[model samples]
Target chain A: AGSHCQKTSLRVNFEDIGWDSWIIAPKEYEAYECKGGCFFPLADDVTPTKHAIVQTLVHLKFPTKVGKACCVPTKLSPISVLYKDDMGVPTLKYHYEGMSVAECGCR
Target chain B: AGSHCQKTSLRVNFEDIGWDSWIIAPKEYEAYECKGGCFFPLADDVTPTKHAIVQTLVHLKFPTKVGKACCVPTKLSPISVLYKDDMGVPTLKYHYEGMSVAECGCR
Candidate 1:
């Protein structure tokens, strides 16, 4: 519960984000986001990258001088999007490499 | 120096590995390797993944039951190599993705 990098859920709604026009099937999908700060004494699950580990220390000691490492996706899984192609056909393509976040890390 | 994850150099010699037969130029290159253990109270520079951090703890607590996380390459840079083609002609390539290590991490 301490402030630390964690996986948070997010619903990527095509219609809401203006991606509904050509997208045919499922209007939305669960795309998790990495949130929270890379605080000192990072939790075991924080998955701090080497650069991130050092950056976190520099940020804590020199709060005004350096920025903390960011919490971001470390692993990504592709999603098959059903959308209309140039010919206006509902095409199911397997390509969105970053559509889903599998894991989060500090970097 | 205390024990911790670190980057170590490695010389990948084509001749030594019997790769000199087809490789035309610069028969070898420097390929870094990640070495060392994920010790407790891990150094901030360790750049551990969430799983590695947790595994390190579990390993320390239950050494007999669990294995420690390993030090491995986190970032890799491609290497260019000139080699013989099917026709026995020297050809140039720039796509050995794991030929060189750019950064190391505990994972």
Candidate 2:
């Protein structure tokens, strides 16, 4: 069976993306990545959009002439980052959107 | 020249879909549909998701081997539907989502 839309663990270190200097605390966090194959006969569970359905249908008809819908992040959540606040302590909090993947779908 | 992601006026009549008799208050409403071409090098304004970009690229590479990303509704609004209650008047209000298109994007 082909892999379906699913989230995989991704531990991002503050230093990995060059956000370490301003970011404090845990030093690393678990975000996530969407990995899967957009295969034949997509189910409603993946929340396939109307366009995806049409594209998928064509792909099935001409497997080599049309590209399969890709599995990508659909819903995303914000991740809270800790920083050294004005009090000189790692207590500042900031929410960064697009830091965490919530759901995946074929699009 | 090709049509891009944009909203075009669309009036939907409940009667057309067999909901006229019961649905009161302006038996018809302006519910738009998404129509346009997913051209090459889509701009950020089109709100193309990451997957759309990838799909678009493939379509450009193999015009006949891949399908173009399609324009679809990204945001939808609820339409106020009126129904007759026990009092026998069109007074009951109900919101039906997916009735109107608020925004369109290439997907």
Candidate 3:
């Protein structure tokens, strides 16, 4: 079944630390109840930084109608640090926004 | 408080796609009950790949005693795809292993 939007990926970097990097895979759905908001869980493939810092933002797009589409920008925010014995897992929370009815059709 | 292990970050790339990348921030803990394995949630800062592919592995370290330490390598496995209206969030699961009593001391 063809979805209103298609699946895609994004290349992400953390705070310009030049060490932390990630390949994010985001999917799109088609439904009215799919409104509200979204949360992108940061994976473990990332490299932790020495100091805490603000993350960088990225751009994304999704198809609305058969031919039309819209833009949804991404934002990264620090959530918490997960500890497993001797290893520390620095975690971050992210979301998608800046969409219009004509582009996303969620609302 | 000096933990048995320190928090660290990892630089990750997905399937050598040359697009998906991530800077993982992993934390460490000090406790006896912190055993039974770990799961590193894939964040949204990653770039998604087209075809379903296996993720790359990374190396990590954690301390056991006050001076001694251990090594923990990471492994990435496909979990599920999170859909957000028009955007697709590809997600992966990770864990840390290859540790001994002298390194992790969890058990």
The best candidate in terms of DockQ: 2
DockQ of each: 0.02, 0.06, 0.02
RMSD of 1: 17.2
Interface C-alpha RMSD per candidate, 1 decimal = 14.6, 8.2, 20.7
Which parts of model 1 are misplaced by more than 4 Å?
A1-107
DockQ rank order: 2, 1, 3
| Model no. 2, DockQ | 0.06
lDDT, candidate 3, at B42:
23
Expressed as tens digits, the lDDT of each residue in B50-80 for candidate 2 is: 4455446545655674456566667777767
Which tens-of-lDDT digit does each residue in B2-103 have in candidate 1? Answer: 577776775556665456788887866776555677777787887765445544554565577545555656786778889999999889887755566688
Candidate 2 residue-wise lDDT at B29: 80
Alpha carbon lDDT of residue B101, candidate 2?
A: 65
lDDT of 1: 0.66
Location of the lowest summed lDDT over 10 successive residues in candidate 3 chain A: A50-59
- Give one digit per residue, the lDDT tens place, for model 3 in B1-107: 22322223322222121223331222222211111222123223223211100111111121221111111211112222122223344433233221111122110
> Each model's number of backbone clashes?
4, 1, 51
Which residue pairs in candidate 1 have backbone atoms (N, alpha carbon, C) closer than 3 angstroms, thus clashing? A47-B49, A47-B50, A49-B47, A50-B47
What candidate 3 gets wrong by more than 4 Å, as runs, is A1-66, A85-107, B1-107
